[PDB]
Design an enzyme around this catalytic site. Structure first.
Site, short mmCIF file in Angstrom:
data_model
loop_
_atom_site.label_atom_id
_atom_site.label_comp_id
_atom_site.label_asym_id
_atom_site.label_seq_id
_atom_site.Cartn_x
_atom_site.Cartn_y
_atom_site.Cartn_z
N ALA A 12 0.83 -1.20 0.00
CA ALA A 12 0.00 0.00 0.00
C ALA A 12 0.86 1.25 0.00
O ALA A 12 0.62 2.19 -0.76
CB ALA A 12 -0.94 0.00 1.21
N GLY A 146 3.72 -3.22 6.47
CA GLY A 146 3.17 -1.91 6.74
C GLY A 146 3.13 -1.58 8.22
O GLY A 146 3.39 -0.44 8.62
N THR A 179 -7.31 -7.98 2.99
CA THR A 179 -6.68 -9.22 2.58
C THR A 179 -6.51 -10.21 3.73
O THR A 179 -6.19 -11.38 3.48
CB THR A 179 -5.29 -8.94 1.98
OG1 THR A 179 -4.47 -8.26 2.94
CG2 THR A 179 -5.41 -8.08 0.73
N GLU A 183 -5.70 -8.01 10.43
CA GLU A 183 -5.41 -6.59 10.28
C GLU A 183 -5.76 -5.78 11.52
O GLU A 183 -5.01 -4.83 11.82
CB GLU A 183 -6.13 -6.04 9.04
CG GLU A 183 -5.74 -6.77 7.77
CD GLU A 183 -5.88 -5.94 6.51
OE1 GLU A 183 -6.30 -4.77 6.61
OE2 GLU A 183 -5.57 -6.45 5.42
N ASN A 206 -9.84 3.07 4.13
CA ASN A 206 -10.06 2.54 2.79
C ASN A 206 -11.54 2.44 2.46
O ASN A 206 -11.91 2.51 1.28
CB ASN A 206 -9.40 1.16 2.65
CG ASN A 206 -8.09 1.22 1.88
OD1 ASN A 206 -7.69 2.28 1.38
ND2 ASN A 206 -7.41 0.08 1.78
N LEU A 252 7.29 20.93 8.36
CA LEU A 252 6.72 19.84 9.15
C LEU A 252 6.46 20.27 10.59
O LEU A 252 5.49 19.83 11.21
CB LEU A 252 7.64 18.62 9.10
CG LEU A 252 7.89 18.04 7.71
CD1 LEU A 252 8.89 16.89 7.76
CD2 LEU A 252 6.57 17.59 7.10
N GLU A 254 5.32 23.02 11.54
CA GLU A 254 4.08 23.79 11.61
C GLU A 254 2.86 22.89 11.57
O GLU A 254 1.81 23.26 12.11
CB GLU A 254 4.03 24.81 10.47
CG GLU A 254 3.02 25.92 10.70
CD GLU A 254 3.12 27.02 9.67
OE1 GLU A 254 4.24 27.51 9.42
OE2 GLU A 254 2.06 27.40 9.11
N1 LIG Z 1 -5.52 2.28 -0.69
C1 LIG Z 1 -4.78 1.20 -0.92
N2 LIG Z 1 -4.76 0.16 -0.01
C2 LIG Z 1 -4.01 -0.95 -0.25
C3 LIG Z 1 -3.25 -1.05 -1.40
N3 LIG Z 1 -2.61 -2.24 -1.37
C4 LIG Z 1 -2.94 -2.90 -0.24
N4 LIG Z 1 -3.81 -2.11 0.45
C5 LIG Z 1 -4.44 -2.42 1.74
O1 LIG Z 1 -3.39 -2.62 2.70
C6 LIG Z 1 -3.67 -3.73 3.57
C7 LIG Z 1 -2.74 -4.93 3.37
O2 LIG Z 1 -1.41 -4.60 3.69
P1 LIG Z 1 -0.28 -4.63 2.55
O3 LIG Z 1 0.30 -3.25 2.37
O4 LIG Z 1 -0.83 -5.15 1.25
O5 LIG Z 1 0.83 -5.64 3.13
P2 LIG Z 1 2.39 -5.27 3.20
O6 LIG Z 1 2.60 -3.88 3.77
O7 LIG Z 1 3.03 -5.41 1.84
O8 LIG Z 1 3.03 -6.31 4.24
P3 LIG Z 1 3.04 -7.90 3.95
O9 LIG Z 1 1.97 -8.55 4.78
O10 LIG Z 1 4.40 -8.44 4.36
O11 LIG Z 1 2.79 -8.16 2.48
C8 LIG Z 1 -5.14 -4.06 3.28
O12 LIG Z 1 -5.95 -3.28 4.13
C9 LIG Z 1 -5.37 -3.63 1.83
O13 LIG Z 1 -6.72 -3.31 1.62
C10 LIG Z 1 -3.26 0.00 -2.32
O14 LIG Z 1 -2.58 -0.08 -3.35
N5 LIG Z 1 -4.03 1.12 -2.08
#
Ligand SMILES: Nc1nc2c(ncn2[C@@H]2O[C@H](COP(=O)(O)OP(=O)(O)OP(=O)(O)O)[C@@H](O)[C@H]2O)c(=O)[nH]1
Ligand SMILES: Nc1nc2c(ncn2[C@@H]2O[C@H](COP(=O)(O)OP(=O)(O)O)[C@@H](O)[C@H]2O)c(=O)[nH]1
Ligand SMILES: [Mg+2]
Lengths: 437, 156, 431
Positions: A12, A146, A179, A183, A206, A252, A254
């Protein structure tokens, strides 16, 4: 220069990052290969866009950007996409094995195989900076990278750069596109370990973006590309002040001053209008009054909550385009004649305003129509505690039965970290209750 | 020179000729091992039909029980030896004998899915309301584990 | 996470394993020669997951073929894709297992186990990022069960950081050759609980009942059953072999569907059900596939989902169809049937879509359920095991090979402990 370094973590973070830098390049007249013919300066300079772009001797404008994932699938697209030649190749960093939606893997086991390399690469970028301000960090809440790696990175950036500011753009999970079922765990875990290392964090629900794409852009099945483009135009509205001459949120530091009265409650709500479908290219103008009033309708918010049932601590309006200040002041004047917008006792109940008279840019190939004026309202209200509460309730249901916990204690984490992270989030919920009469 | 133990093991192993020799020298046809099993028990367990038959023509107690209350028909119905099931029944096997777990031959034939043996036992008057010590009939067993073929045979 | 190392052990293991390659190979456009003669490059984007590249533009399955009886390597080499496996990856003994778990686990299989590990090490040291292992076997035999569990345990010890995933065929009197199978399956289940991350329970009872009653095959053959197993195995691995986001790799799927380490036995299903070559049918639509997917009659584990509660569920639709057509239906199932999904795991049903449908059909759906109703399968096995064990029938076969009588009582208690764990979460409430 007062540089800003953008760090993108996980799928993401990376894919949103590449949407933003595409948009930036169009707003600053930068070409897909880094060239900007509109730049008089030979091979450098101190213009406001240089906070985000370094300059080379060939006239190549290079993002001050780092892309990090623990698997290469996504970052390999950046390496071969339209903007393959724009970024520092050494600033595109990947492992081979992702964190499998497991915070513990991202922060403890897999993430720490690559953390020291990531920091050495950021150091290199920081050593090209005249006066580094800090970092903008993009990541999702629900990914193992993430959440876990991001939290690990923020802890290390605090040690090695104690002076600098750190800003977050975090993707708040939604069942529509989710996914993984864990989460909620990752969301709480990273928020807890990151809270004390982030000065200000903009959550991007999202689901909110999903609903806007359906309701305002008439898209049946919003794709990530759809959500990203919309997100990256909201992100641009927020960072415009750092990349352009202006009078509001010029650095930043501010951001904190204007939006964060107390360090813990540092999650401003963003509302953006107008969102108009590109098929309605001949839509009639919306006035300053109408787009300003649209900033208080829940449909246009980035995070689902009810500000009318909360109380404001800060409010900033960042207009773009054909926006006459006197019309803004009159639009606000009527806004303060609406009894449903309550402010806390202890803050000035006024609105800080900034205007960038460039007409908003929208990406060719996107779903948004070109508009004459737009506005992004950044408000720190206590209503955003409803979003933490939604996540906390899910966390409580699964953690009551210790569902999926074994996955985490098997990857370097102590089970006690769950309860303390949830206590920190309970303290946050009462932090919001205490501020809001 | 006791032949009881060697008659037992010859019947277990299917040594039909040794079976005949040992009986020719006065070997106890109803000899029991430590658990109370007889040559007929062991011939019926391991599917040795002709040894089953020969023992029955020389004074074997068809309804003998071991210490756990098992009769030859139980084990034949458990292991699934249809021909031996019918031989034992024609020589007066108690079709509704109960062991120490409350099981009848029909219970064991039902658990292990020996549907033809189920039918033979039914035609010889197996009690469909016979409960094991958990209160389960053979029909309860077929309902609990969703054996539709077995359930249909038991309602006929 | 790229490569998967596939192993097949025993006659059932190698037979259903062969059918797996014949089918996935054709979806991926690889011929019996390893030459790719396909029709699009989504068939290639993720083919490294199950195939090595052999330098002549050829593709070789990353497969290890194991059995103590040499008869069945004659078998597989004879098959349609018999000559595309690496000859060096045939690890076969001469003395079989005689349907004896103890022989496979302790004596004859233990003599061959490290010859097998040598080939696994050769395969694994050639992988860029090995995700884990996939084993296909029976639990009712001697080699697939005994040696298979031994191999799981020793592969686990050597690769503790990788995922272990099995396709385990459960014995059933409707199809069985011997009455010792409840012994072999109960002794096997004990090791699967401890050393596997995911196990797909392919019940022969269910496969027979499907062929017998819904497809109306008078006398089902082993090939009739494997047609169903082949389709299931192909469906459940679609998201591993094609570009996707949900359940994209073995560890991500495990993290989502296994809330508790021991409760990792899945109940696979698939819609529509066809018989070999009679597949031409009206069409089927999205609302129909969704309901047939969740139908007891469509599962390959002989258990009623209605008699328990879903902990996690994974659904895979295949073919060109309206996706939110799909997303309306699978959200409708959940709220109308709210009581059969546990309240304390929100959003526990995930949906994947793959545009590539299987051979012979333009639309398909695969079901992966982690239901507490799976207790019914193990209770069925436990009752037969107890029936035999209480009369101590044929235990001389196991003790004579160096096994102890208390390993049987321990296995019995571990199966029942597993049963108790399911019923514990089946009755639990959010409260
Ligand atoms: N807005 C947006 N959300 C995303 C995108 N890709 C994944 N997500 C969301 O991000 C979450 C999943 O985390 P990811 O970022 O795909 O996983 P990661 O950070 O690569 O970490 P890993 O588990 O190791 O793969 C879910 O809530 C998805 O709906 C994107 O391109 N845009
Ligand atoms: N579905 C299926 N089951 C099989 C096949 N071959 C054997 N089995 C089953 O596996 C059990 C016998 O185990 P088997 O694989 O033959 O012995 P092994 O060689 O020692 O593993 C019985 O439960 C059979 O129903 C097959 O081709 N398909
Ligand atoms: Mg990722």
């Amino acid at each position: 220069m007062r540089e800003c370094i953008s760090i993108h973590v996980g799928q993401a973070g990376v894919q949103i990052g590449n949407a933003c830098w595409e948009l930036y390049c169009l707003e600053h007249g930068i070409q897909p290969d880094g060239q900007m013919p509109s730049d008089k300066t030979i091979g450098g300079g101190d213009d406001s866009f240089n906070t985000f772009f370094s300059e080379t001797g060939a006239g190549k404008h290079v993002p001050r950007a780092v892309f990090v994932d623990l698997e290469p699938t996504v970052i390999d697209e950046v390496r071969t996409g339209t903007y393959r030649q724009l970024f520092h190749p050494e600033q595109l960093i990947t492992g081979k094995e992702d964190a499998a939606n497991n915070y513990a893997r991202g922060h403890y086991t897999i993430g720490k195989e690559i953390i020291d390399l990531v920091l050495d690469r950021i150091r290199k970028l920081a050593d090209q900076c005249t006066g580094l301000q800090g970092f903008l960090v993009f990541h999702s809440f629900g990914g193992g990278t993430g959440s876990g790696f991001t939290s690990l990175l923020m802890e290390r950036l605090s040690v090695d750069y104690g002076k600098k500011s750190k800003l977050e753009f975090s993707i708040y999970p939604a069942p529509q596109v989710s996914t993984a079922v864990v989460e909620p765990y990752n969301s709480i875990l990273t928020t807890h370990t990151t809270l004390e290392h982030s000065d200000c964090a903009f959550m991007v629900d999202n689901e909110a973006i999903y609903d806007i794409c359906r309701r305002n852009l008439d898209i049946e099945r919003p794709t990530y590309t759809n959500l990203n483009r919309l997100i990256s135009q909201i992100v641009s509205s927020i960072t415009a002040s750092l990349r352009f001459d202006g009078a509001l949120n010029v650095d930043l530091t501010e951001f904190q001053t204007n939006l964060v009265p107390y360090p813990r409650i540092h999650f401003p709500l963003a509302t953006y209008a107008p969102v108009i479908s590109a098929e309605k290219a001949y839509h009639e103008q919306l006035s300053v009054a109408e787009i300003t009033n649209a900033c208080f309708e829940p449909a246009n918010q980035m995070v689902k909550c009810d500000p009318r049932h909360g109380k404001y601590m800060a409010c900033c309006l960042l207009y773009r385009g054909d926006v006459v200040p006197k019309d803004v002041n009159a639009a606000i004047a009527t806004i303060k004649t609406k009894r449903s917008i309550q402010f806390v006792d202890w803050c000035p109940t006024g609105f800080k305003v900034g205007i960038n008279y460039q007409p908003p840019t929208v990406v060719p190939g996107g779903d948004l129509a070109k508009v004459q004026r737009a506005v992004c309202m950044l408000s720190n209200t206590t209503a955003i505690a409803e979003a933490w509460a939604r996540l906390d309730h899910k966390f409580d249901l699964m953690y009551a039965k210790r569902a999926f916990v074994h996955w985490y204690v098997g990857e370097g984490m102590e089970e006690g970290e769950f309860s303390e992270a949830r206590e920190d989030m309970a303290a946050l919920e009462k932090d919001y209750e205490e501020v809001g009469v | 020179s006791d032949l009881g133990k060697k008659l037992l093991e010859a019947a277990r192993a299917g040594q039909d000729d040794e079976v005949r020799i040992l009986m020719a020298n006065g070997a106890d046809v109803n000899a029991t091992d430590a658990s109370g099993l007889t040559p007929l028990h062991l011939a019926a367990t391991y599917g040795h039909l002709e040894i089953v038959e020969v023992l029955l023509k020389h004074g074997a107690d068809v309804n003998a029980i071991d210490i756990m209350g098992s009769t030859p028909l139980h084990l034949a119905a458990l292991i699934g030896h249809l021909e031996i099931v019918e031989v034992l029944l024609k020589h007066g096997a108690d079709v509704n004998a109960v062991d120490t777990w409350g099981d009848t031959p029909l219970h064991l034939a039902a658990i292990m899915g020996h549907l033809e043996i189920v039918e033979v036992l039914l035609k010889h008057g197996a009690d469909v309301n016979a409960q094991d010590k958990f209160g389960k009939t053979a029909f309860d067993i077929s309902i609990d584990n969703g054996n539709e073929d077995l359930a249909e045979i038991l309602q006929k | 996470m790229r490569e998967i190392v596939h192993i097949q052990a025993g006659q059932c293991g190698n037979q259903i394993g062969a059918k797996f390659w014949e089918v996935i190979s054709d979806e991926h456009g690889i011929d019996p020669t390893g030459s790719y003669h396909g029709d699009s490059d989504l068939q290639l984007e993720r083919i490294n997951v199950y195939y090595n590249e052999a330098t002549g533009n050829k593709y070789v399955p990353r497969a290890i073929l194991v059995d103590l009886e040499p008869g069945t390597m004659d078998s597989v080499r004879s098959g349609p894709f018999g000559q595309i496996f690496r000859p060096d990856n045939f690890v076969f003994g001469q003395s079989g297992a005689g349907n004896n778990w103890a022989k496979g686990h302790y004596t004859e299989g233990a003599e061959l186990v490290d010859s097998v590990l040598d080939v696994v090490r050769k395969e694994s040291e050639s992988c860029d990022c090995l995700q884990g292992f996939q084993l296909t076997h029976s639990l009712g035999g001697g080699t697939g069960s005994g040696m298979g569990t031994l191999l799981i345990s020793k592969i686990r010890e050597e690769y503790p950081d990788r995922i272990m995933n099995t396709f385990s065929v459960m014995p059933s009197p409707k199809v069985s050759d011997t009455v010792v199978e409840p012994y072999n399956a109960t002794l096997s289940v004990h090791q699967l609980v401890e050393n596997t991350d995911e196990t797909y329970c392919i019940d022969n009872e269910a496969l027979y009942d499907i062929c017998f009653r819904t497809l109306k095959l008078t006398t089902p053959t082993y090939g009739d059953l494997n047609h169903l197993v082949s389709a299931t195995m192909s469906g459940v691995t679609t998201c591993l072999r094609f570009p996707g986001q949900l359940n994209a790799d073995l560890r991500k799927l495990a993290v989502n569907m296994v809330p508790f380490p021991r409760l990792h036995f899945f109940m696979p299903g698939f819609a529509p059900l066809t018989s070999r070559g009679s597949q031409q049918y009206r069409a089927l639509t999205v609302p129909e596939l969704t309901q047939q997917m969740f139908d007891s009659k469509n599962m390959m584990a002989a258990c009623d989902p209605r008699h328990g509660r879903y902990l996690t569920v994974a659904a895979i639709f295949r073919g060109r169809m309206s996706m939110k057509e799909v997303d309306e239906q699978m959200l409708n199932v959940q709220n109308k049937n709210s009581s059969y999904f546990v309240e304390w795991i929100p959003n526990n049903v995930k949906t994947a879509v793959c545009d590539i449908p299987p051979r012979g059909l333009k639309m398909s759906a695969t079901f992966i359920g982690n239901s507490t109703a799976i207790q019914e399968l193990f209770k069925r096995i436990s009752e037969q095991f107890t029936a035999m064990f209480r009369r101590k029938a044929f235990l001389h076969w196991y003790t004579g090979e160096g096994m102890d009588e208390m390993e049987f009582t321990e296995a019995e208690s571990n199966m029942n402990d597993l049963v108790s764990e399911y019923q514990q979460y089946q009755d639990a409430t959010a409260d």
